[PDB]
Design a protein around this ligand. Structure first.
Ligand SMILES: CO/N=C1/CCS(=O)(=O)c2ccc(F)cc21
Lengths: 237, 300
């Protein structure tokens, strides 16, 4: 059934599972027309498909051409997501295929279930958690590859960099969701915290800066402070 | 005109015949129901005064044989039984219809309700949903589950309705996932009508029979089946025009006949609101929409 605070440790057991987030698949800018009406212009998007145990990210870039001449795009986007997720599963070796797929929005359940009928033994699960994966496009290297794409493309990342050499998956996911929650609540301040010092470098093959253990504790504290504040600045407390 | 003769009435019981019903007292002198119209299937059904658990009954057609009821004190129910003989079925009733204690199948001559509820229902199809081939009539009760229910436990006692499942490979063509899930026309017209049912009359027959089992016996799996067969039509963008017109009539008379106090359990809010207001055929069920709104505006 649904995933929530009570069964949180299941994410890090040894059953392969993937989170699928569709919030950045269909992306538009809204603008006025010469005649003073409103129109949308699509921009490139992405499916965020993540193994929370290993950090492996399957970033399927959604090129704007996929919407050309199509109607009801927000509905199509969910089915396109499910089509691509199912294609990814079929492309993986059997021993790499997930035993569960957890969708971050409940509207993905029926489209994914229908596209995965061929996989009766893969459980499609919602979650009650309010995960911050929409903020993936606040990670500069991910945003950069999505916007530069000129055709559909799959790009593979490890969203944890090398962190698993030193910390557990539980701790790595907690750090990731903290960073992404911060980026979502106040991107500019989150990014100042991470990137205010250009000598803490991001390795060419990484997404985040090469913080020592001690610098990660300071960083994480600063992100908590940001989230608590924004929550005041918002509700005035 | 034909008659269903009763050996006796040893236990107090409410007896239904089609949409009619009457109370019989313990050991009341009662030998049957006469004037039963030829040309339609019928159902005769029972609810004991002591145990309202288990409404049960028998679908039958008078053209298929001479049928009577006798109570079994071991199994504790009124049984429909078959007696082939004009030297017995005639020799016994000819005595019973000189002593007048039956009520008329009480059909008002203006009334086409029963025809309208059973237009497409045919005993030969009932006997395939209710498998018991040694009898010409078919027993149903409140508790019998459907094939589809048992997949999700005694098969001999199942209702073998046609399995409909909108999230199944039968329903969804590979490569047409989104198309086929949002427009079920493929599944209705190609899979179900052309493939399984062969024609719309057989489809409507099973739909009508499911409704009647839901109404007369409170059979929950039947109600599920009735709503599934409605929803498959309403969720198809492409339905023959004659089917839509006929479905509107079918549903109108089912809604007309439903007991007003049973709408809470027999009617599925989601299916009806989707069918009448959101679906492809939202504008194609005028008679059904009008009666639903004037009679059950709460559900909507
Ligand atoms: C006393 O009636 N006994 C019986 C059983 C034998 S029968 O089959 O001829 C029969 C037929 C009709 C009936 F209403 C009753 C009976």
């Amino acid at each position: 059934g649904a995933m929530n605070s009570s069964n949180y440790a299941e994410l890090f057991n040894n059953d392969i599972k993937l989170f699928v987030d569709d919030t950045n698949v269909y992306r538009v800018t809204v603008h006025k027309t010469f005649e003073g009406n409103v129109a949308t212009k699509a921009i490139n998007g992405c499916i965020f498909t993540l193994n929370p145990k290993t950090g492996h990210l399957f970033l399927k870039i959604i090129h704007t051409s996929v919407w050309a001449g199509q109607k009801r795009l927000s509905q199509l986007a969910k089915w396109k997501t499910a089509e691509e997720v199912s294609a990814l599963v079929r492309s993986l070796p059997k021993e790499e295929q997930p035993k569960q797929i957890i969708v971050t929005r409940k509207a993905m359940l029926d489209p994914l279930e229908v596209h995965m009928l061929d996989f009766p033994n893969i459980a499609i699960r919602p979650t009650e958690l309010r995960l911050p994966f929409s903020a993936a496009m606040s990670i500069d290297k991910l945003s950069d590859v999505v916007m530069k794409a000129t055709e559909p493309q799959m790009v593979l990342f490890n969203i944890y960099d090398d962190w698993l050499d030193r910390i557990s998956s539980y701790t790595a996911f907690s750090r990731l969701t903290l960073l992404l929650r911060a980026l979502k609540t106040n991107e500019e301040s989150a990014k100042m915290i991470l990137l205010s010092d250009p000598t803490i470098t991001i390795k060419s093959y990484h997404l985040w800066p090469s913080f020592t253990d001690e610098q990660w504790i300071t960083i994480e504290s600063q992100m908590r402070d940001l989230i608590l504040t924004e929550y005041g600045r918002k509700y005035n407390v | 005109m034909n008659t269903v003769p009763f050996t006796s009435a040893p236990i107090e019981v409410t007896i239904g015949i089609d949409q009619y019903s009457f109370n019989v007292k313990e050991n009341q002198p009662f030998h049957g129901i006469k004037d039963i119209p030829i040309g339609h299937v019928h159902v005769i059904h029972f609810q004991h005064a002591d145990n309202s658990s288990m409404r049960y009954g028998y679908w039958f057609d008078c053209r298929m044989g001479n049928f009577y009821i006798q109570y079994d004190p071991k199994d504790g129910l009124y049984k429909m039984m078959e007696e082939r003989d004009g030297a017995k079925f005639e020799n016994i009733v000819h005595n019973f219809k000189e002593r007048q204690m039956m009520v008329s199948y009480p059909k008002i001559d203006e009334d086409d309700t029963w025809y309208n509820l059973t237009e497409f229902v045919q005993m030969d199809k009932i006997r395939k949903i209710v498998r018991k081939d040694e009898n010409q009539f078919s027993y149903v009760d409140s508790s019998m589950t459907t094939v589809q229910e048992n997949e999700l436990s005694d098969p001999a006692h199942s209702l073998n309705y046609t399995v409909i499942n909108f999230k199944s490979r039968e329903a969804i063509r590979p490569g047409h996932e989104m198309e086929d899930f949002l427009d079920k026309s493929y599944y209705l017209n190609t899979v179900m009508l052309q493939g399984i049912f062969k024609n719309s009359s057989n489809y409507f027959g099973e739909l009508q029979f499911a409704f009647l089992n839901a109404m007369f016996f409170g059979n929950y799996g039947s109600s599920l089946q009735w709503h599934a067969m409605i929803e498959l039509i309403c969720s198809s963008a492409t339905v023959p025009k004659h089917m839509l017109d006929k479905l509107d009539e079918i549903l109108y008379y089912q809604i007309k006949t439903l007991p007003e106090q049973y709408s809470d359990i027999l009617l599925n809010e989601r299916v009806w609101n989707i069918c009448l207001y959101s679906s492809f055929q939202k504008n194609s069920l005028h008679n059904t929409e009008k009666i639903m709104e004037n009679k059950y505006p709460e559900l909507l």
